[PDB]
Every structure is written in structure tokens, then in C-alpha cells.
Amino acid sequence: YVNNTLYSEFSTIVIGSVFVNTSYTIVVQPHNGILEITACQYTMCEYP
Amino acid sequence: SFNLSSYDVVYSDHCFSVNSDFCPCADPSVVNPPSAICPAGT
Numbered sequence: 001y002v003n004n005t006l007y008s009e010f011s012t013i014v015i016g017s018v019f020v021n022t023s024y025t026i027v028v029q030p031h032n033g034i035l036e037i038t039a040c041q042y043t044m045c046e047y048p
Numbered sequence: 049s050f051n052l053s054s055y056d057v058v059y060s061d062h063c064f065s066v067n068s069d070f071c072p073c074a075d076p077s078v079v080n081p082p083s084a085i086c087p088a089g090t
Contacts (some may be wrong), residue, residue: 013074018068018089
């Protein structure tokens, strides 16, 4: 309730096999009530 | 590098499956085996 405004946010989850550039990492993420369900060949690092 | 001729078809014979920890080389400090440095995780 920052500035009397409702904000929704929670943690995200990733799914894959090796997480470098080969497996399609299904990652969801909410953006103030808008979900981002993408399945691309992202470049995950050691400290996300 | 998987080149071939124009009208060439390739089929697999055996399909091995491993976990997400297999490094294609050994440890560099066990020779004393073309070993090298493998990334973290494997």
C-alpha cells in the first residue's frame, strides 16, 4: 500500500535442464498484475 | 560440424541419456587424459 496504491508481487519460478542457452527455460513473472509466461533460450547465470 | 552431401539422410543408432552434471573431460590435477577446466555445476 505504497502511497495508498495496491501493488501485487511474488516470487518467480524457472524450469529447465542446464540453463545456459540450449533448454527452453519456462519462466513466469508478474508485472503489477500482468503475467509474463515466456519460453525462450535465455542465458541464466550463476546468481539470479 | 555435421556436414554431408546434398541428398543425404542421417539416422541415430544409439541415444544415451545423462544427468545435468556430466563434464566431457576429467580433472586437470589427476594426470600426475586430455583434461581441461569444466564450468561450474558439472
